[PDB]
Amino acid sequence: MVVALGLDFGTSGARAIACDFDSDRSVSVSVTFPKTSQNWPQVWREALWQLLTQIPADWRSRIERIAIDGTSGTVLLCDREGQPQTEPLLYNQACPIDLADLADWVPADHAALSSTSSLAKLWFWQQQFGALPPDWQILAQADWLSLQLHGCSQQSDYHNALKLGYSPDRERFSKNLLDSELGALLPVVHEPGVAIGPILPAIAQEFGLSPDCQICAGTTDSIAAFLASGAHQPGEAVTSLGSTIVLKLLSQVAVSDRLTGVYSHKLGGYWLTGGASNCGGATLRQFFPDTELESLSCQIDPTKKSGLDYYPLPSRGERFPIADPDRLPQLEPRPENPVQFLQGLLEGLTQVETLGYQRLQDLGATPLKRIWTAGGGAKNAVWQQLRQQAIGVPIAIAPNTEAAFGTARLAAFGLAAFHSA
Ligand SMILES: O=C(CO)[C@H](O)[C@H](O)CO
Ligand SMILES: O=C(CO)[C@H](O)[C@H](O)CO
């Protein structure tokens, strides 16, 4: 019944989606980020006000809850007032630090043990600033942007906080990390979806929002994209068939594998696990454009195996399901008819998804029940036939894939659906 606002801040831009879930009606507005900037916080915040502005007044007067998802790993170093004291470290930027320095702050093989993690970037900043002031704070993109709305400093969610060192399984930072030099900069971690506080009165009156509107705890954009699908039962999974095949499986058990980068986000009483293969649509685009890809797909009969057996790597190295930094793209033997060649490629990608989900299950995750598909290859029915014959479960196109929609659902209902009974 709630009318909720989902704010999505991703890699290339930002999208706002407001939904009346009672009548199931929505409105969506967009803003495109520059290719690069000199003041990214300014870009993000201006994008925030711009998004709020593009939303109709009749909608804004009825928004009761707001949630924000941001890119994972994009952090900001700020004072007490939330003002950036240096350039933000982006999601894709790595830091040349020694992970052994973070050994006594998180358990072994923790997800925060990565050169691109928020914790590694915090330690990074600590190195060049020498001594970070105790009254300062580190804030993920979503954290900072929501801070622009509710004004409560040092507030984050246990999705963004995971790679900062948070342990969602025991729902805490280690006492070693809390009593460390970085502990004073750490945020208070809440569950994604819960109310942090009311919206700032000035902001509410300025943008014609209700002064009783609640600003909720945020999440990451990939998780929000998963939330867009609506899947909330263990064994349900979302497959993203984009440039790279990305699997996300909902399970009752947290599974992990550091060699393949597999970890688990907490999701209510459940866990969202998954992985990412280097194979994907990019390998297909190496041979055919999209139009030719379709033109050939319409001639493929998935019932009869091509006989070919490819591993559709586009380049050097494979992460998931099996880790091999020196594995070759096996796109041989390439045959006569490009139709059966494309069929072979599709069979390869199919095997990638299959081995992926089966491997996820083998690590202890809840057995697969069904697949919701997103990305460019989602509409490919032949590919879907190969997949749904190889996996063993029903496969359908995800009703919604927009991160902003999943974030709007996060604002409206939180993670309440992700519990036993
Ligand atoms: O750049 C992005 C990733 O898609 C943002 O989510 C933006 O909303 C674009 O739609
Ligand atoms: O948040 C991120 C973690 O790599 C990326 O920006 C990506 O957009 C995820 O969907």
Swiss-Prot record:
Biological process terms in GO annotation: xylulose metabolic process
Binding site for ATP: 243, 281, 376-380
Pfam families for this protein: FGGY_C
Entry-linked InterPro entries: ATPase_NBD, FGGY_C
Keywords: ATP-binding, Kinase, Nucleotide-binding, Transferase
GO MF entries: ATP binding; D-ribulokinase activity; D-xylulokinase activity
First-tier enzyme category under EC: transferase
Cofactor: a divalent metal cation
Enzyme Commission number(s) of this protein: 2.7.1.47
GO CC, any one term: cytosol
Catalytic activity, reaction form: D-ribulose + ATP = D-ribulose 5-phosphate + ADP + H(+)
Sequence positions that bind substrate: 8, 12-15, 72, 221
Superkingdom of the organism of origin: Bacteria
PANTHER family: D-RIBULOSE KINASE, SUGAR KINASE
Family the entry assigns: Belongs to the FGGY kinase family.
Cited function: Exhibits ATP hydrolysis without substrate. Phosphorylates D-ribulose.
Protein name in UniProt: D-ribulose kinase
